[PDB]
Design an enzyme around this catalytic site. Structure first.
Site, mmCIF file in Angstrom:
data_model
loop_
_atom_site.group_PDB
_atom_site.id
_atom_site.type_symbol
_atom_site.label_atom_id
_atom_site.label_comp_id
_atom_site.label_asym_id
_atom_site.label_seq_id
_atom_site.Cartn_x
_atom_site.Cartn_y
_atom_site.Cartn_z
ATOM 1 C CE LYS A 1 1.072 -0.421 1.547
ATOM 2 N NZ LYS A 1 0.513 0.951 1.770
ATOM 3 C CG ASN B 1 0.443 -4.700 0.867
ATOM 4 O OD1 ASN B 1 -0.463 -4.709 1.702
ATOM 5 N ND2 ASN B 1 0.470 -3.853 -0.159
ATOM 6 C CG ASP C 1 -0.330 -1.853 -2.703
ATOM 7 O OD1 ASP C 1 0.351 -0.921 -2.232
ATOM 8 O OD2 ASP C 1 -1.514 -2.008 -2.376
#
Length: 339
Positions: free
Chosen positions: A157, A160, A155
């Site tokens: 990006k 985050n 995840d």
């Protein structure tokens, strides 16, 4: 190199103990005072809370069990908690407590008041190459750690990546994190950050994290991601094309690194070769990077978020405060028995 190998071996022993005997039910809701909602999603929320007894602030992720089941995120939520309680690395947000009740699942984490990298990137426009390299280096170490334990993150990006008071990264949201030896098949992540092999749907491995690093680095330095379009389908076309257009101000070394990270065929991609992460760590773009100093947080950060006090939330968007519903009847008991 010997200090790394020795560090990773100890880390694996630490991980495996906790992986095999996961911590459960280490707090209760009544121990915490609600301060403000920091963010909302389709099956949960994250709230700033204060531990009543100690006065310490935390970020509490609350997931609605019924909504997790409906959106088919059961295994994913179980992965998230099991992995988070077992890992220990500077650039991963620490899980301090977890528990569940009739209605919800709870993960109480260290609160990072500096907010998401994404918001800072938008405010600033784009990061300098030295600036981007600082953040990238931390992600490289973080993946080196995660992959050594057979964990894929999936995840990556800027949304985050939380910025702590030292100006260092803290990775949050392990919803897509998974322990796997070899290949896995779930279509998950963010369209802009997806590796070709995920889109192609033939299965994939930890090499998807290195691809995503290429996207992150590009986005940081350019101010926008390398593959952008009106609709996901058009984004996916650009991704699998084998074509990237680099800004004029990008150094030759940066372009070479991104050509090697944003490499469409997973068998020539940097980080997935026999030589693994060293192909990245020893790349010319990182020649100036002192990897040990980074791990230690001894390198001067480019930016320190303004501290505005405990429980200040100015680096987060506003959200209406909704109730934390706790049913009298236990929901989804079987599905979340391991949590």
């Amino acid at each position: 190199q010997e200090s790394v190998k020795e560090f990773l071996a100890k880390a694996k022993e630490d991980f495996l103990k906790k992986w095999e005997s996961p911590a459960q039910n280490t707090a209760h809701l009544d121990q915490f005072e609600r301060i403000k909602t920091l963010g909302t999603g389709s099956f949960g929320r994250v709230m700033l809370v204060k531990h009543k007894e100690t006065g310490n602030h935390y970020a509490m992720k609350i997931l609605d069990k019924q909504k997790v089941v409906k959106l088919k995120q059961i295994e994913h939520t179980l992965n998230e908690k099991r992995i988070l309680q077992a890992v220990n690395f500077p650039f991963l947000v620490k899980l301090e407590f977890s528990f569940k009740d009739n209605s919800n699942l709870y993960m109480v984490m260290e609160y990072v008041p500096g907010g998401e990298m994404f918001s800072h990137l938008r405010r600033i426009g784009r990061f300098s190459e030295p600036h981007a390299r600082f953040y990238a280096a931390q992600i490289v170490l973080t993946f080196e750690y995660l992959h050594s334990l057979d964990l894929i993150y999936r995840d990556l990006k800027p949304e985050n990546l939380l910025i702590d008071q030292q100006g260092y990264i803290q990775v949050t949201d392990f919803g897509f994190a998974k322990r796997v030896k070899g290949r896995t098949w779930t279509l998950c992540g963010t369209p802009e950050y997806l590796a070709p092999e995920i889109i192609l749907s033939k299965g994939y491995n930890k090499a998807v994290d290195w691809w995503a690093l290429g996207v992150l680095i590009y986005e940081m330095a350019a101010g926008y991601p390398p593959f952008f379009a009106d609709q996901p389908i058009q984004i996916y076309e650009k991704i699998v094309s084998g074509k990237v257009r680099f800004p004029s101000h990008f150094s030759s070394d940066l372009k070479d690194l991104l050509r090697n990270l944003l490499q469409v065929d997973l068998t020539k991609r940097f980080g997935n070769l026999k030589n693994g992460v060293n192909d990245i760590k020893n790349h010319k773009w990182f020649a100036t990077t002192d990897w040990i100093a980074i791990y230690q947080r001894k390198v001067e950060a480019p930016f320190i978020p303004k501290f505005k006090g405990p429980g200040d939330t100015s680096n987060f968007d506003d959200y209406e405060e909704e109730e934390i519903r706790v049913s009298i009847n236990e929901k989804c008991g079987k599905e979340f028995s391991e949590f």
